[PDB]
């Protein structure tokens, strides 16, 4: 299934501050009104059983725009790399309940890797204790650790609130990260509206990444490499992925230097006029 990613995917093209000016630049962006592929998580159901837990590997292409609405923070992180198998370095980003760790190691990835928080019956607590991205790792080039943070560990299903968007691109071998998080509690699941993403982190790794996979997580379930989506599954969650393309855009900087709007130049003849 596909959904309309109307406006989203715009981010500050550069570090430079600009104000009250319309500047045109060319980078890899998500074309307006492009289809995005919707991935889903379904809880076990009746005999038919809708239940889905979608963690396939997807192509890295030029760059990926990733957005998710999570009932609970089922989605722990992503994997980037060509093989996603050892004997090659691969980017691995996972957030345990405590913090975020980014690591390049030549990990021994499981066939179906995932993470997880388990929800205990006796008490309310949600705890992450399922971490099976990889069996082992060697020759680790770079590693980073974030601060502690709190997220939804427990299994819950729906796209009630948190809306998180990210842009992953490579610039001169650079791995760039952009993000914007806005709650869409009232807001529609993958809403229509415009928001700009700003760069969080710089990863100088220089990994050539062909493909990436998203890692869903729920500690209610145990993990072994070779786990073929068996066992219990996490609450409902949906994430989207789109592909960036070289295109021109006209960005509108407000007084603040915030990007209020944008025009997809190529989108249509009307949009082209706006460009000139």
């Amino acid at each position: 299934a596909y959904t309309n990613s109307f406006t989203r995917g715009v981010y500050y093209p550069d570090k430079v501050f600009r104000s009250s000016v319309l500047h045109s630049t060319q980078d890899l962006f998500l074309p307006f009104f492009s289809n995005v592929t919707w991935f889903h998580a379904i809880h076990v159901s009746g005999t038919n059983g809708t239940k889905r837990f979608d963690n396939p590997v997807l192509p890295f292409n030029d760059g990926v725009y990733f957005a998710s609405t999570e009932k609970s923070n089922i989605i722990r992180g992503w994997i980037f790399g060509t093989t996603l198998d050892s004997k090659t370095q691969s980017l691995l980003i996972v957030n345990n309940a405590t913090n975020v760790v980014i690591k390049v190691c030549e990990f021994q990835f499981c066939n179906d890797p995932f993470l997880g928080v388990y929800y205990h019956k006796n008490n309310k607590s949600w705890m992450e204790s399922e971490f099976r991205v990889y069996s082992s790792a060697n020759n680790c080039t770079f590693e980073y650790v974030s601060q502690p943070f709190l997220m939804d560990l427990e299994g819950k299903q729906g796209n009630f609130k948190n809306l998180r968007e990210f842009v992953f691109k490579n610039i001169d071998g650079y791995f760039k990260i952009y993000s914007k998080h806005t709650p869409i509690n009232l807001v529609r699941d993958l809403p229509q509206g415009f928001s700009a993403l700003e760069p969080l982190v710089d990863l100088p790794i220089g990994i050539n990444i062909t493909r990436f996979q998203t890692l869903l997580a729920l500690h209610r379930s145990y993990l072994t490499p070779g786990d073929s989506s068996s066992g219990w599954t996490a609450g409902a969650a949906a994430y989207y992925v789109g592909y960036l393309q070289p295109r021109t855009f006209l960005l509108k900087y407000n007084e603040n230097g915030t990007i209020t709007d944008a025009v997809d130049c190529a989108l249509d003849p009307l949009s082209e006029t706006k460009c000139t």
Partner: antibody
Amino acid sequence: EVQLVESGGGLVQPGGSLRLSCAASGFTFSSYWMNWVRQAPGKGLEWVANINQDGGEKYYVDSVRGRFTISRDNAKNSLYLQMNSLRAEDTAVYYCARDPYDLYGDYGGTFDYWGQGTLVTVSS
Amino acid sequence: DIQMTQSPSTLSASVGDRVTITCRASQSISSWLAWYQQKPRKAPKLLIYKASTLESGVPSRFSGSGSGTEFTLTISSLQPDDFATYYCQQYNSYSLTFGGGTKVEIKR
């Protein structure tokens, strides 16, 4: 016969609590989300609360958030709604309805089956 | 959030005529709209889902269409049974919301 029978309505003073229950039959209860919707007579129909099939994920309307808790006992084939700090405003007829899966998203079917309703009155 | 506003709030039509109730969302719900029929004191019954899919067992007289933000439930040949209040709802995003309700009455 898919059926939903609600019980527990009554007269309640402000501050009080009640728990309504809805016994379901005719389908695999464990596999579906259940919701509680209320119709307060002068006003209209309002969606109160929802629970995921697993029973973990639970959502509520803002007015009720601290006050109401929805829960279910699959073995029991029963759904419950415990209410607290009742206000005069909560007076309404409460219906238990079987909801669609949110996952369906743009193609949501809405609530297929509904119960007769339990009337709760909050007055001094 | 999203507000659904139905119109007209009330209408009276003769038997056999075509009735059209509209519902307008504050913002794009997409296809996420359903319609319900409610009789006095009785619980609501689901007429349509996904804007135009007839629920099982519902009479063919009822149909629902929609595009954009605006959706319409039409009743091709009004019958006396049809007396009721009809509500639209949008499942698109939380919280779930119902329209005000349109009361239909048989004109005599």
